[PDB]
Ligand binder design. Structure first.
Ligand code: UQ
Ligand code: NDP
Ligand code: ZN
Lengths: 208, 230, 115, 86, 96, 125, 342
């Protein structure tokens, strides 16, 4: 257990659990769940309507003052009714801590923009709009950031194909770069890698 | 023989009574396409062709050699549509390449009466096409075009002809044994004094049965192994 | 009820007026686009293309989907006006290198293995 | 011009097919005795509706709804179809 | 041992050559076809069979960790030699 | 502040998928069968959505397998059957659903190998 | 069908169309479009070239990997012709030159080379042969170019009975010598037109139409021994055509009549250059001659092609000849010229 196993820190575990207690107590209206992982990471699951309040609290409260927004991303889970899971990672330099706030949405429900709370979100939300198609309400300028001009679709969705639907080549007849339906000389080879025996009994699910 | 077996089943039913839903009578088929063809109203056997020889003959994958050109008049237009060159291909005037069971999403009916559908794993080689698509294209070319254009539409028509062909895992059926038993008593054809011998006498007759089996080198190896041990 | 949240419009009337204003803007912008990008198409051709693009989504009855389509159309128009798009991006709407794929049964039967 | 096949799709446990079922269990055999060479295909139905299909020369085909028909109505419909009617 | 087809094209160790009816030959016009002349099937046949006085021998291909995984080959069969599944080396026992 | 939309959810216009890949495609929703080369059953837990196989030809150069179907490698994983059905419905795809197959419970007995009169007794062990 | 040449795919760049084509004269105006159209389908294209390989690099991106194969050849050496057509099922001939060099004459490029190509193709078993002639090819024509074209047409037909012969007329396009030729005469101030260009009628055809017609003739099974005439949809007088050309390019049109003998002398003067001549006496004769009318021959409509009128594609050719002030003018601004049809 000593050499090849990652050591556990329980002091940070208790501190993060107590702060989850504190945050869940102050904001019962929006906080839906608080979790602490075994590698000492604190997550708060909130109702979407509380994106602006909770974040503001975490930025402005004296005991929290999470004054840095490290990252803002989304995860696509097609099996959920609310498809997209929005993740905010915040850093507190005053207390040398990190926190995670997660909410959810679907293809048609917008989310309040947090640019007022964090100026850094301006581009991040654009990427979430570009890659996942999640609309953010009250954004100073929401447009595509990463894909090509006029690119149809949101590639980071699970149902979007790996190679897309169109490809570009230069045509001499029209004397310009044109887009055509994608064709591949060699098809991407799909590998079925998952083993038919479970690896981790701790994560076993109810027998359905 | 069918009348005798139905009589045995009738005796069993009228002696033991109606035990419930047991369905004593059973017919064991050996052809994948037989039950579907019977469900669609085809005439079993080739008696009609011998009785009234046609001028145009459509061989839809028929390789049993039951009908040859000696059984047909001259200038007979034989059309073969299939996937292997076998008994029925060299006698054809036009050959239409079709798809095999691994190359189409097609419906086959079990000996139980259970309908199932295959899935496309590969695509037909060369210029080979799906069989119903070939027939539909031919109908359009002749001007007497068919009212269905996709696979779902032809399966809707299939449901119209026989609705049980679109229930893809249900084996439940209705027993009408007594009606068929009553109808079997009208004719009284006499049995033949010939012993019942199956065509499948030994293991060596099992490997090559259809066109795909005959074209397989593994089955030829198996036959050569069972004929001489070595 | 379905308990759904709006983006901009409450019903289909607000969505339709937004669609109409976006169509007005595109109709106004087409000649300027033709002059700036030095396109070899006519203004009438470009307006037909705009009309066809709008009519492709004429079947939508959800105000939320209509609002999102209008938002995407505004982004496309902003890219076109600011000349962020190049001539290639504008001309991709016309598909001048793609041979016409036939639709009837016999042509599909003659060409390939798929419907 | 003439009759080539008859198809009765009856829904096995649906109440609306009850009368049709009665016909099959009573007066089908006699009918098949009157028409030794007429295909009369008795087929299983979904949860939808009982129907009767009549096919004529050159692939003409028309159907009649048999929902809630009594056995007498079913045999009258067969008598009409078999005769030069409908 | 590389041979030549009646077309005049060198036949690879996999035994493939473009047919006389194959247009793909044009890619070799004014150019050459890359063929390796060291056929492994011919080179391994020239190796003498090794006679060892044990029922089970071990083969690692030679070189230790620079060979293949070490395997054990049984030599009870007398009408056939024991072949390594990795290297193709043959082993037998003193006979006659 | 709600609008209470009525009709069926449809996001086909917002996905960027070409029309020919919506109206002509057929998806299969199923639980994959256990690989009979193994006894583990961990791959028979989740539901899967895949698409119908399209044409694959061979490259004139090097003889590789070329395709033109962009959805030939797309497989989606779902918890329940109705989740997959809802996803397919809202994405505008026609679907075929195969109901889950489970091996029925079997009555095993080691003593049956040594029956006094039944046929169950084993010739060798 | 030597199954490696059965169509497979969606007709894309990576697809296989069953076409193996040897395109003689593929480094020219029509050749680049023909090769591009062949490579779009996924065809195996053989490009015989005699020029510097650099001058062929614009043909590199027109096909998938290995689909375009370049080989050297000589017009006078039949061994190279055999070497480049050994494995092709289609041979397209586009070899021609508007002027005579010291090494090749009109008979060399329009009679000898086409006949050698046809004979070698017939010997090698090529199934389809497409040969390009001129609409105005006549044995008794006043120009050597068209007399050679007619003689070559006869000889190709004799050597390859099942050849498809295509006769276009004054192809216009980005790299043409028809619109660019008239536009470049602005450098001399005035435009010399014999009889003010009022005695000549032209029916020019678009380059993409010709390329599509060649492709469709390749894929047409019943176009074996037929002869086609590819013409545009409108006929114009030379004066009206040049006036429209100068109106599209927004250049001052100052036409003057020049006698036939003097303008022939001008062509003789320009012939002397060792480079590509600006004009020649043969160009003089071909420009001032009316396009023939051949109502007995099939045209582009028989191949499923609808001819593209000059008024929709002139701007893409003549915008390069504009000054900065008129460079952004639209296509709807020129009020198309008068057409003398029927
Ligand atoms: C597209 O193809 C073509 C070319 O290629 C690019 C050419 O160069 C070309 C001919 C080259 C001209 C465009 C150049 C003309 C230059 C002038 C006419 C020089 C004459 C002007 C005087 C000599 C200067 C002094 C004024 C006099 C009155 C004395 C032609 C016609 C052509 O068509
Ligand atoms: N107005 C028009 O354009 C229409 C064209 N004509 C015919 O259409 C054909 C092609 O037209 P186009 O592309 O415009 O002509 P180009 O001059 O642009 O090119 C002709 C091709 O033929 C090759 N070629 C020319 N001379 C020789 C030679 N002595 N030996 C070998 N190869 C040679 C050239 O190769 P390289 O570049 O290396 O020299 C070149 O690739 C020609 O046969 C022409 O006669 C038909 C009606 C009119
Ligand atoms: Zn070894």
């Amino acid at each position: 257990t000593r050499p090849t196993i990652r050591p556990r820190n329980d002091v940070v575990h208790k501190q993060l659990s107590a702060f989850g207690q504190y945050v869940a107590e102050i904001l019962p209206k929006y906080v839906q769940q608080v979790q602490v992982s075994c590698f000492n990471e604190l997550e708060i699951f909130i109702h979407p309507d509380g994106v602006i309040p909770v974040l503001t609290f975490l930025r402005d409260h004296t005991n929290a003052q999470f004054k840095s927004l490290a990252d803002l991303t989304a995860v696509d889970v097609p099996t959920r009714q609310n498809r997209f899971e929005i993740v905010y990672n915040l850093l507190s330099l005053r207390f040398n801590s990190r926190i995670r706030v997660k909410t959810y949405t679907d293809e048609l429900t917008p989310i309040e923009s947090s640019v007022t709370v964090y100026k850094a979100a301006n581009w991040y939300e654009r990427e979430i709009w570009d890659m996942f198609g999640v609309f953010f309400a009250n954004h100073p300028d929401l447009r595509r950031i990463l894909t090509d001009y006029g690119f149809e679709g949101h590639p980071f969705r699970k149902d979007f194909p790996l190679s897309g639907y169109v490809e570009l080549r230069y045509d001499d007849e029209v004397k310009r770069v044109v887009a055509e339906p994608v064709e591949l000389a060699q098809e991407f080879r799909k590998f079925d890698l998952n083993s038919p025996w479970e690896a981790f009994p701790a994560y076993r699910q109810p027998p359905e | 023989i069918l009348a005798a077996v139905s009589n045995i089943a009738q005796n069993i039913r009228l002696s033991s009574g109606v035990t419930g839903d047991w369905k004593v009578m059973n017919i064991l088929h050996r052809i994948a396409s037989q039950v579907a063809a019977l469900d669609l109203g085809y005439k079993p056997g080739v008696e009609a062709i011998r009785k009234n020889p046609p001028k145009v003959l459509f061989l839809l994958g028929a390789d049993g050699g039951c009908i040859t050109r000696q059984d047909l008049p001259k200038d007979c237009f034989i059309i073969y549509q299939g996937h292997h060159g076998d008994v029925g291909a060299p006698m054809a005037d036009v050959i239409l390449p079709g798809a095999a069971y691994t190359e189409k999403s097609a419906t086959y009916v079990n000996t139980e009466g259970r309908a199932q559908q295959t899935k496309v794993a590969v695509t037909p080689p060369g210029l080979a096409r799906e069989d119903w698509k070939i027939i539909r294209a031919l109908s359009e070319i002749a001007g007497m075009t068919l009212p269905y254009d996709t696979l779902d539409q032809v399966r809707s028509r299939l449901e119209e002809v026989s609705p049980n062909l679109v229930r893809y895992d249900d084996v439940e059926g209705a027993n009408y044994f007594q009606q068929a038993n009553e109808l079997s008593k009208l004719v009284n054809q006499q049995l033949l004094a010939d012993p019942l011998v199956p065509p499948q006498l030994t293991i060596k007759d099992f490997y090559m049965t259809d066109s795909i089996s005959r074209a397989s080198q593994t089955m030829a190896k198996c036959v050569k192994a069972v004929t001489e041990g070595i | 009820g379905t308990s759904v949240k709006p983006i901009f419009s409450r019903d289909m009337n607000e969505a339709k007026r937004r669609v109409r204003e976006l169509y007005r803007a595109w109709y106004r912008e087409v000649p300027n686009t033709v002059h700036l990008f030095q396109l070899d198409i006519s203004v009438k051709q470009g307006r037909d293309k705009v009309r066809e693009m709008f009519m492709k989504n004429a079947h939508v009855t959800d105000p939320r989907v209509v609002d999102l389509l209008v938002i995407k159309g505004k982004m496309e128009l902003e890219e076109t006006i600011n000349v962020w798009k190049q001539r290639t991006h504008i001309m991709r709407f016309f598909h001048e290198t793609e041979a016409p794929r036939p639709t009837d049964f016999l042509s599909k039967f003659y060409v390939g293995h798929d419907p | 011009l003439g009759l080539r096949e008859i198809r009765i799709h009856l829904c096995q446990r649906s109440p609306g097919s009850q009368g049709v079922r009665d016909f099959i269990e009573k007066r089908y055999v006699e009918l098949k005795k009157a028409n030794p060479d007429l295909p009369i295909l008795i087929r299983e139905c979904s949860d939808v509706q009982p129907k009767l299909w009549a096919r004529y020369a050159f692939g003409q085909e028309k159907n009649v709804s048999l929902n809630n028909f009594s056995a007498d109505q079913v045999t009258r419909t067969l008598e009409n179809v078999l005769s030069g009617k409908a | 041992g590389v041979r030549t087809s009646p077309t005049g094209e060198k036949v690879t160790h996999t035994g493939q050559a473009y047919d006389d009816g194959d247009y793909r030959r044009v890619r070799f016009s004014d150019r050459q076809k890359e063929v390796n002349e060291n056929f492994a099937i011919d080179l391994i046949a020239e190796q003498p069979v090794s006679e060892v006085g044990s029922r089970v021998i071990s083969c690692d291909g030679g070189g230790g960790a620079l060979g293949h995984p070490r395997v054990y080959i049984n030599l009870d069969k007398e009408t056939k030699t024991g072949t390594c599944g990795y290297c193709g080396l043959q082993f037998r026992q003193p006979h006659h | 502040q709600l609008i209470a939309v009525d009709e069926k959810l449809d996001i086909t216009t917002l996905t960027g998928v070409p029309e020919e890949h919506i109206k002509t495609r057929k998806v299969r929703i199923f639980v994959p069968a256990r690989n009979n080369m193994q006894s583990g059953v961990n791959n028979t837990k989740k539901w899967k959505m895949e698409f119908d196989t399209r044409e694959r030809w061979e490259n004139p150069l090097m003889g590789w397998s070329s395709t033109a179907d962009p959805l030939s490698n797309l497989v989606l994983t779902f918890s329940t059957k109705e989740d997959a059905v809802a996803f397919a419905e809202k994405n505008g795809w026609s679907f075929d659903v195969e109901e889950r197959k489970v091996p029925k419970p079997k009555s095993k007995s080691y003593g049956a190998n040594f029956s006094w009169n039944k046929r169950t007794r084993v010739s060798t062990k | 069908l030597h199954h490696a040449l059965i169509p497979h795919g969606k007709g894309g760049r990576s697809s296989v169309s069953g076409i193996v084509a040897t395109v003689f004269g593929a480094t020219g105006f029509l050749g680049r479009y023909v090769v591009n159209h062949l490579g779009r389908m996924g065809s195996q294209v053989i490009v015989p070239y005699r020029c510097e390989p650099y001058d062929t690099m614009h043909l590199r991106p027109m096909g998938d990997l290995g689909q375009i194969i370049f080989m050297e050849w000589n017009g006078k050496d039949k061994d190279s012709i055999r070497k480049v057509v050994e494995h092709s099922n289609v041979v397209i001939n586009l070899v021609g030159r508007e002027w005579e060099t010291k090494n090749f004459d009109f008979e060399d490029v329009f009679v000898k080379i086409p006949h050698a190509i046809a004979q070698v193709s017939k010997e090698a078993g090529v199934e389809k042969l497409i040969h390009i002639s001129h609409l105005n090819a006549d044995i008794k024509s006043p120009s050597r170019y068209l007399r050679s074209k007619a003689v070559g047409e006869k000889e190709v037909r004799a050597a390859f009975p099942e050849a498809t012969i295509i006769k276009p007329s004054d192809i216009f396009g980005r790299e043409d010598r028809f619109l660019n030729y008239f536009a470049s005469m602005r450098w001399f101030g005035g435009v010399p037109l014999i009889s003010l260009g009022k005695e000549t009628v032209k029916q020019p055809v678009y380059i993409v139409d010709v390329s599509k017609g060649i492709i469709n003739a390749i894929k047409d099974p019943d176009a074996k021994g037929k002869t086609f005439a590819f013409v545009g949809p409108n006929r114009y007088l030379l004066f009206d055509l040049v006036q429209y050309i100068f109106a599209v390019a927004y250049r001052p049109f100052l036409p003057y009549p020049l006698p036939h003998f003097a303008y022939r002398w001008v062509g003789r003067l320009f012939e002397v250059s060792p480079f590509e001549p600006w004009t020649t006496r043969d160009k003089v004769e071909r420009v001032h001659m009316s396009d023939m009318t051949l109502p007995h021959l099939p045209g582009l409509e028989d191949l499923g092609i609808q001819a593209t009128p000059l008024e929709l594609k002139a701007i893409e050719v003549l915008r390069r000849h504009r000054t900065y002030r008129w460079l952004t003018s639209e296509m709807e601004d020129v009020k198309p010229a008068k057409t003398v049809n029927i």
